[PDB]
Paper text:
We present the in situ structures of the symmetry-mismatched portal and the capsid vertex-specific components (CVSCs) of HCMV. There are four major components of HCMV capsids: the [name] ([name]), the triplex dimer (Tri2), the triplex monomer (Tri1), and the smallest capsid protein (SCP). In this study, we show that the portal of HCMV is composed of a 12-fold symmetric (C12) main body, a 5-fold symmetric (C5) 10-helix anchor, and a 6-fold symmetric (C6) turret, and is specifically adapted to pack its large genome. The main functions of the herpesvirus capsid are to package, transport, and deliver the viral genome.
Author numbering:
A (entry chain g): 168 to 261, 273 to 290
B (entry chain M): 298 to 464, 468 to 591
C (entry chain M): 1 to 176
D (entry chain a): 393 to 588
E (entry chain a): 1029 to 1370
F (entry chain I): 6 to 117, 123 to 306
G (entry chain B), J (entry chain Z): 1 to 49
H (entry chain m): 50 to 194
The structure:
């Protein structure tokens, strides 16, 4: 899907891993969770979380803003990473879909 | 809704922008006044009697005047030792000279250069810049250790035959170059200096090793200061008059308030190790996208 | 912009230990050059009192009134004079915007709402947002105090600008 | 492959070796080169101008001489002792209020100022300036700036200043008749090649 | 016309059938029996059969030769599409925003983009930023230029094969393994210059710190933020440290020429990127051996190109010169009778 | 890999009939040894009065699990599972399974049909779904926090409410962590560690947002500092004027604070995390065994 | 690095050598990889250890 | 000639000058020092080479010869007597050297020609064009500063 | 894909191939994951650059994929990328004591202390330096000490940070001692401090009014050794804050245990987020070690 | 450092090697000059150069 797909890359890495990422933007009154499918050349989890923190610090400040504006309501999380697998840089097809897809149903790994 | 202080801070906005100057009227920096600061809700009182402004201006006068009273002390010391020896000065700096030469005119040019240098003294000069390493952190133990290593006894053959091996023949000198062919005075000058081994005089070169060549120019005059505060004032022909700079008629906390040498703390891009080769500066610049 | 709010809240939370008051500043091309503002490491301020020395020492008397006496060993006191001189400075926050801008249009491009009496649209090539503190000893405050702005570059060199407390609060204290 | 575009042949050495073949009307747009015609992979007359070079001419790195200044200042003064004559400047700063009475007081000396470097880049003709007889070729580094080595507080410091207009280029690199032909092209542009 | 005169370079890759000569048993090829290795899949079973080969030269000197013989097509377009500096330096922007926006509207580049991090550039090999165009009617392209003085004497700097750097930077003229004499020959200016006995030809192009020197030495590009994937045709003339590292005795220079001093341009992309240690093709470049570029037929006006095309065979060989107009002639008739010969 | 677990005792055939009902169950082993005795089998090597719970969960992190495969009359073929391949395990714990549930492993405190010898007993860990595992983990930890003040009665009603556990066909009695008005020692260290971490989290961020906002200071730091001000204002509202934090601290006391914060954070990883072991597949009827993939 | 003594002691074969240029030039310009060019009569080939 | 172990560093290579130095005592009154150990006395030697080669003679007898050179009222060449060049060592705790008085330097059976070694600081030529032969001289020049 | 071939540029001596053939079943980090590579992309020497930062090598080494060395035949070494869950063997080049049942991590090469400079492979301007295969508690201690050295060193003069860092760089693990060579302040280290600060403040907010006072309750109640050793720290804290007495805690007013469960759940979320910044992933879990600690086998990928 | 593969593959003389202490004790307490103890079965004997 062209709407949910995004990256921060020239997508010229060879092995493109994929990552499901959702967020929790509290600029709306209840929540406006931006669901996203994210490819990346980067494969390690932690440094990817750091790059995502560098990209999504607006949702973090919105998270702390929800915490100060409503103490009784508990803030649940900020976002959850889960890898799905990996492909090749030519396997994309502009709705963007993949011809081969190795699967890896990883874990719900949260982050703030 | 426990509404945040940030949103009412922004939506409260800023009252007015007021600029202001410094005391010397050199810089002009602007001050904002936000309404949602806690400055308003403390109910401060304010008053200024004129005697406090007078004492404040006197203290600021002392803080500006400490450097120039040090320079006046230097000039008084020059004239004091010049009266004290009786007018006969030696040659402390190596330069070949001629015998058949008019020398009274060099005395006249020396008096002229001395008055010119007193006219153009500044806080960016010889004695201040040579004083800044003396005010530093490890200066006390360094001078104590250099004094003890200087005042060590003649070594017995025990420490020469089994002890550790023993061990700065050049100095980092600071200079004020004045010159009266153009009435051009040069203030912050650094000079590498050591002894000529063929004689007993001094040789003054650049950090590159230029063998600094103003001493042959008949119109210039230089002031030399050493890190141990030895004093030199050299007219052309290599003759010079020497002294010590005396700061004992001055306070201590004024000298540390004015130009105490800076000590830095750790920021980004700096070694937590002490003293390695650091990388480049942080350099937040507008030529790039700021990333 | 973003440092002014934080320093406001910090001086609010730290008010009972030292009764410093926030002083939100902007500096521009009239103060320091752009080469100096691109490598500006950190700032430094000191609330020197009205009549005398500073804030970081004892109020009455110290061991720094003595002459230096022109010695090699303890040339200015020793290390304790260095400690007293390092203790009296406090580090303010720091934020530099090295691109040309207009202050009011910048703050309206952020969330704030500037309501100035008349359009003093100031223009500049680079804006560094600094925020000092100035002391009140009791809850009152004398106008004979002074500040010392110290701007440090990583080479070790610095510059110092000084101004009193009277000109800072000539109208704004009289507006309350 | 490499090729030039927009050069300037000298006028006092001008000639024509194709007279019978070509005949061009004598307007200035044919009297000053601004194009270049090459051949493609097919035998086809392509054309490059200054317009299409805008992806290179307008880059912000072209106007930043700071790495150029750093490379110019790390190799400092010329170590040749024969050329210790051009690196002399006294660029002071003094007040201007007392200058109107200090101007007869300036010539109370009878000692000249040394010659500036930008003056020394103008007494070479168009064709010897590339030769080694010029001293100032280590000063000319960039068509947008002036690089020099001369003295502040008795230390030779490098100084890079920008040539705000095109007049500050040297005549060996930018001669006067070239400026005259450039103005003639401008007058042809405004339909003014016969002036009133 | 502004107050200077830019001069362009370009790299143009042909398709060559080179013939190869070798004496009887120039080398000895040692082989052995094939060795199998079994790889198990779920459905297929792929065996990689291997066989190792040692080749030993049986000659003292160069016992085998080649020669470039016949071209049939030109892979690049031989066009004049100017090299986009805003994509090889995607970071350097103007300080004030509105003048930068106005320049981006003036040129074709849309917006600056952030360069990648260190770890991302570790994982991926390079940028490959620019897009393949839709219709590529003539082949790939490159044209990069240098700001030169308009008083450069064209008759000795644009009519013969000359080094466009300003000086003759041929390292082979230097006595080998001498590093001081090399910078004395290519950087200093209080002495003569080889192949043209002036000091230089362009003071904005020769010495250290020229805009050519700060823009096409690769170390000066690493000092700022540059892009690695794009190929610079100037870069073989200004990477100084590579030329100082190429200062050997000339047999070793020839060995590095046929072994290591061959270049990479990918043939599939629309621009000219560089291979990332690719084993596809190594492009032989004779210009790198001699540090000289070749003058191509350029013409100031339309009419001089017209009377060039009207003339017969060898009409491209001459160099006609009007008052303010000029034609440089090709030193080899590869525009005369290559594409007509096919 | 195979493990052979023998018995030095005499094995009654009635106990063989008991043991063949354990045809494929999870058992832990302290070290992967090919031939092993039965004294290292199970969790009877760690049972006592004083250690209790957290010691077993700590010692379960580094033990390797295995499955019984077949039964010889005096040795058992234990089979260490490998990742990706799937096996059939038995539902040992009291909770019944459902499809798709990630299975975690927990020491059986409540346990109460086991192999019986003269001094050695067999005990098998509970194979519980992960959400119930985290649920009873935080239930036991809060029940350990409340352990000092049960002299009052609404807190007795609170721990009585916390005593039971709601799940599908499940009313378990989680055992009391405090015994005879005293806590067992590892839970005492655990609750003490999270208490002091909660204390130093309050007492050090008030310094470190100041220490860190002298760099680039985004709005994250600003709202963090305002939240810290809210915490300080709601903390010392019933107190005298302010805590009044100082700026010039001794270095080594700060080192001893921060190192203690991290080193007591280090001993809480066994409680904050969960080893997922099996992701279950299609279950047998009546839910007494299931084919499961070993996600280890 | 290279046992040049074994070249001078072991019996060789006799080949008509045809270098391209002069052989001292090919030696002095380092076409080959490892060289042991000298003059006179080295007794290096005698002390066998 | 015999020599204590404190001096035979930088001497396991064959071929080096050997000068016997005088000593005003009675029992060790003559001592055989190498030229390199004399390098801690020459003002011609730069600081880098001096701090190198003084960091190999950190034994007992090397510093004793260093003191004995700088303790008399006389000069060096009134206490230095040249013996020539070594060709073999023996490497005991009291090493035995074989110096060469007159003639070439070679191994037994003449299979290896030893070479005279001199450090770079003491080397000095006064012509760019050496002849077919050039003699070698040992120059001590005193700085009476 | 599972096998990759690295070919050398230089000729290989007998000493070269003899040094290589002792490196069978050793770890090699490869960044690029290409099927064929040159030796400049081998190991770690392409990114070894001192006076830059140990956290830089720790960051980029975390992204590089691993392999094992086997079937060396000259001008090729045939590295084999291991896949998940299978059983492979590993020889430790670094002098780290290995114990069974232990989980391993990859760290950049911190020097042993004598600075042996055993490059163990010779090229003209290339070396084969290796990352240290290290047990999990040592790597956890390295990350912890690294973050402590990061947080402490802000706004400090060189004197106190020298007298602290000279104690903090020294580590001990099983009769050994190592140091951290390039501990400098970097950007990734800085953003990890900011996330740790946010997480610690979230732990500060998300503590109830009874978990905060539990150590106070036990300080009234019991006296063990660690009770005193924690009470001194909290007492020095509260004495540097206020010059009063640390108050006895009160009765729990509002008990409503779902708030406490959700409170501890949010505390657990933020504490796992804080804990992941020091914990690295397990890259090898051992099965059995040699008694010489020269090699072992491991059931994990690279 | 000798080629222990050459010791492995060459045919050996069978000797009743009977020293006093244990073998591991006489090895690890450094009785011999250059030791080389592989515990498994090293494949370094199978690579010939």
């Amino acid at each position: 899907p062209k709407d949910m797909y995004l990256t921060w890359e020239e997508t010229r890495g060879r092995l493109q891993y994929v990552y499901l990422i959702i967020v929790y933007d509290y600029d709306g009154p209840e929540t406006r969770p931006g669901i996203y499918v994210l490819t990346s050349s980067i494969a390690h989890w932690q440094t990817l979380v750091d790059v995502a923190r560098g990209k999504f610090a607006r949702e973090r400040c919105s998270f702390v803003n929800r915490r100060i504006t409503r103490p009784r309501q508990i803030p649940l999380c900020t976002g959850v990473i889960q890898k799905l697998g990996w492909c090749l840089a030519d396997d994309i097809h502009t709705v963007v879909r993949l011809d081969n897809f190795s699967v890896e149903l990883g874990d719900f790994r949260e982050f703030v | 809704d426990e509404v945040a202080r940030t949103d009412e801070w922004k939506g409260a906005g800023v009252s007015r922008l007021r600029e202001v100057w410094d005391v010397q009227h050199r810089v002009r920096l602007r001050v904002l006044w936000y309404v949602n600061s806690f400055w308003r809700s403390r109910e401060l009182s304010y008053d200024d009697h004129e005697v406090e402004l007078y004492r404040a201006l006197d203290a600021y006068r002392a803080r500006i005047a400490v450097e120039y009273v040090l320079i006046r002390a230097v000039r008084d010391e020059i004239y004091a030792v010049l009266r004290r020896d009786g007018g006969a000065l030696p040659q402390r700096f190596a330069c070949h000279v001629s015998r058949n030469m008019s020398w009274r005119v060099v005395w006249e040019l020396c008096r002229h250069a001395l008055a010119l240098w007193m006219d153009w003294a500044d806080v960016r000069s010889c004695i201040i810049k040579a004083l800044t390493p003396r005010l530093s952190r490890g200066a006390a133990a360094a001078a104590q250790r250099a004094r003890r290593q200087r005042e060590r006894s003649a070594p017995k053959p025990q420490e020469l035959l089994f002890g550790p091996r023993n061990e700065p023949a050049e100095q980092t000198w600071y200079a004020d170059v004045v010159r009266c062919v153009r009435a051009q005075v040069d203030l912050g000058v650094e000079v590498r200096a050591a002894r000529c081994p063929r004689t007993g005089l001094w040789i003054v070169r650049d950090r590159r090793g230029r063998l600094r060549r103003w001493l042959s120019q008949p119109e210039v005059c230089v002031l030399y200061v050493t890190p141990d505060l030895d004093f030199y004032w050299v007219l052309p022909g290599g003759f010079a008059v020497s002294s010590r700079v005396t700061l004992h008629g001055l306070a201590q906390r004024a000298l540390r308030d004015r130009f105490q040498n800076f000590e830095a703390v750790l920021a980004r891009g700096m070694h937590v190790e002490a003293g390695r080769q650091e990388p480049e500066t942080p350099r937040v610049s507008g030529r790039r996208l700021p990333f | 912009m973003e440092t002014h709010l934080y320093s406001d809240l910090a001086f609010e939370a730290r008010f009972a230990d030292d009764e410093q008051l926030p002083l939100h500043l902007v500096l521009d091309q009239e103060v320091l050059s752009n080469e100096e503002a691109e490598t500006l490491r950190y700032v430094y301020y000191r609330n020197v009192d009205s009549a005398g020395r500073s804030t970081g020492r004892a109020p009455g008397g110290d061991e720094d009134d003595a002459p230096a006496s022109d010695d090699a060993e303890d040339a200015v006191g020793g290390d304790r004079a260095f400690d007293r001189e390092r203790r009296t400075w406090q580090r303010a926050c720091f934020r530099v915007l090295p691109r040309p801008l207009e202050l009011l249009d910048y703050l309206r491009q952020s969330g704030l709402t500037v309501t100035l009496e008349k359009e003093q649209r100031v223009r500049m090539f680079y804006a560094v947002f600094t925020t000092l503190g100035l002391r009140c000893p009791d809850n009152r405050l004398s106008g004979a105090q002074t500040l010392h702005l110290r701007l440090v570059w990583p080479d070790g060199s610095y510059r110092d600008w000084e101004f009193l407390a009277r000109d800072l609060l000539r109208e704004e204290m009289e507006a309350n | 492959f490499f090729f030039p575009v927009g050069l300037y042949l000298p006028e006092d050495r001008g000639y024509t070796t194709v007279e019978s073949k070509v005949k061009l009307n004598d307007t200035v747009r044919n009297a000053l080169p601004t194009t270049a015609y090459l051949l493609n992979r097919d035998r086809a007359v392509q054309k490059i101008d200054f317009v299409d070079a805008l992806k290179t001419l307008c880059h912000p790195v072209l106007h930043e001489p700071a790495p150029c200044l750093q490379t110019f200042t790390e190799r400092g003064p010329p170590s040749e002792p024969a050329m210790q004559r051009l690196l002399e400047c006294r660029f002071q700063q003094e007040p201007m209020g007392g200058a109107a009475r200090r101007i007869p007081h300036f010539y109370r000396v009878r000692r000249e100022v040394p010659r500036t470097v930008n003056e020394m880049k103008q007494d070479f003709v168009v064709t010897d300036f590339y030769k080694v007889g010029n001293i100032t070729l280590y000063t000319e580094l960039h068509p947008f700036f002036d690089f020099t080595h001369c003295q502040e507080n008795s230390e030779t410091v490098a100084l890079c200043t920008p040539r705000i207009v095109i007049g500050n280029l040297p005549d060996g690199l930018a001669p006067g008749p070239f400026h005259e032909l450039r103005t003639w092209e401008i007058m042809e542009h405004m339909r003014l090649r016969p002036p009133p | 016309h502004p107050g200077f005169a830019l001069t362009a370079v370009r790299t143009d890759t042909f398709e060559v059938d080179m013939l190869l000569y070798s004496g009887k048993s120039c080398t000895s090829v040692i082989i052995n029996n094939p060795i199998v290795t079994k790889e198990e899949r779920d459905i297929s079973t792929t065996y990689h059969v291997t066989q190792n080969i040692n080749t030993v030269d049986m000659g003292l000197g160069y016992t085998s030769n080649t020669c470039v013989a016949y071209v049939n097509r030109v892979r690049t377009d031989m066009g004049v599409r100017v090299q986009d500096l805003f994509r090889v330096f995607p970071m350097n922007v103007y300080r004030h925003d509105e003048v930068d926006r106005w320049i981006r509207h003036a040129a074709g580049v849309e917006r600056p983009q952030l360069l990648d991090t260190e770890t991302i550039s570790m994982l991926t090999f390079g940028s490959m930023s620019e897009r393949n165009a839709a219709a590529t009617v003539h082949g790939q392209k490159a044209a990069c230029e240098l700001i030169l003085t308009p008083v450069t004497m064209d008759v000795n700097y644009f009519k013969i094969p000359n080094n466009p750097r300003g000086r003759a930077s041929c390292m082979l003229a230097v006595d080998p393994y001498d590093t001081e004499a090399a910078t004395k020959a290519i950087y200093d200016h209080r002495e003569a210059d080889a192949q043209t006995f002036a000091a230089t030809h362009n003071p904005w192009a020769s010495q250290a710190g020229c805009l050519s020197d700060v823009l096409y030495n690769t170390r000066h590009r690493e000092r700022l933020g540059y892009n690695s994937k794009f190929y610079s045709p100037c870069a073989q003339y200004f990477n100084t440290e590579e030329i100082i590292a190429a200062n050997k005795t000339l047999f070793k220079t020839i060995d590095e020429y046929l072994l290591r001093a061959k270049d990479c341009i990918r043939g599939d992309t629309d621009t000219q990127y560089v291979c990332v240690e690719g084993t596809e093709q190594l492009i032989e470049n004779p210009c790198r051996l001699t540090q000289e570029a070749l003058p191509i037929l350029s013409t100031t006006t339309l009419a001089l190109m017209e009377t060039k095309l009207k003339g017969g065979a060898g009409a491209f060989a001459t160099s006609e010169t009007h008052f303010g107009n000029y034609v440089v002639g090709e030193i080899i008739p590869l525009q005369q009778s290559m594409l007509f010969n096919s | 890999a195979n493990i052979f677990c023998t018995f030095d005792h005499k094995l009654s055939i009635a106990d063989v009939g008991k043991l063949t009902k354990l045809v494929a169950a999870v058992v832990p082993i302290p070290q992967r040894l090919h031939l092993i005795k039965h004294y290292q089998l199970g969790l009877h090597q760690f049972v006592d009065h004083t250690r209790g719970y957290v010691r077993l969960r700590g010692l379960l992190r580094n033990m390797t699990l295995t499955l019984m495969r077949r039964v010889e009359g005096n040795q058992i073929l234990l089979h260490v599972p490998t990742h990706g391949l799937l096996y059939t395990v038995l539902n040992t714990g009291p909770v019944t399974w459902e499809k798709g549930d990630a299975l975690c492993v927990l020491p059986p405190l409540f346990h109460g049909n086991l192999l019986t010898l003269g001094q050695w007993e067999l005990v098998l860990p509970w194979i519980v779904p992960m959400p119930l595992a985290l649920e009873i983990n935080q239930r036991l930890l809060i029940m350990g926090l409340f352990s000092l003040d049960r002299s009052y009665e609404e807190v007795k009603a609170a721990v009585q409410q916390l005593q039971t556990i709601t799940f599908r066909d499940a009313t378990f009695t989680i055992p009391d962590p405090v015994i005879d008005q005293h806590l067992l020692i590892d839970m005492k260290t655990a609750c003490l560690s999270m208490s002091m971490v909660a204390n130093l989290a309050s007492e050090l961020t008030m310094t470190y947002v100041r220490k860190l906002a002298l760099e680039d200071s985004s709005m994250l730091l600003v709202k963090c500092q305002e939240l810290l001000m809210r915490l300080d204002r709601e903390r010392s509202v019933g107190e005298p004027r302010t805590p009044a934090r100082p700026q010039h601290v001794s270095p080594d006391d700060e080192i001893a604070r921060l190192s203690a914060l991290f080193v007591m954070l280090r001993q809480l990883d066994d409680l904050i995390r969960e080893q997922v072991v099996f992701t279950v597949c299609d279950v047998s009827p009546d839910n007494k065994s299931a084919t499961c993939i070993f996600k280890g | 690095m290279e046992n040049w003594s074994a070249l001078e002691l072991l019996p060789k074969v006799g080949i008509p050598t045809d270098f391209l240029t002069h052989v001292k030039t090919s030696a002095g310009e380092e076409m080959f990889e490892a060289l042991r060019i000298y003059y006179g009569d080295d007794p290096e080939r005698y002390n066998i250890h | 000639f015999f020599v204590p172990e404190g001096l035979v560093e930088f001497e396991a290579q064959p071929g080096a000058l050997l000068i016997r130095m005088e000593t005003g005592c009675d029992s060790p009154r003559h001592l055989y020092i190498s030229l390199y150990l004399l390098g801690i006395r020459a003002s011609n030697v730069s600081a880098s080479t001096r701090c190198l080669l003084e960091s190999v003679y950190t034994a007992s007898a090397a510093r004793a010869a260093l003191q004995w050179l700088d303790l008399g009222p006389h000069l060096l060449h009134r206490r230095l007597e040249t013996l020539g060049c070594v060709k073999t060592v023996s490497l005991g705790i009291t090493s035995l050297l074989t110096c060469v008085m007159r003639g070439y330097l070679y191994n037994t059976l003449k299979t290896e020609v030893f070479a005279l070694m001199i450090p770079k600081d003491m080397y000095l030529t006064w012509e760019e064009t050496r002849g077919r032969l050039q003699y070698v001289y040992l120059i001590i020049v005193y700085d009476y500063d």
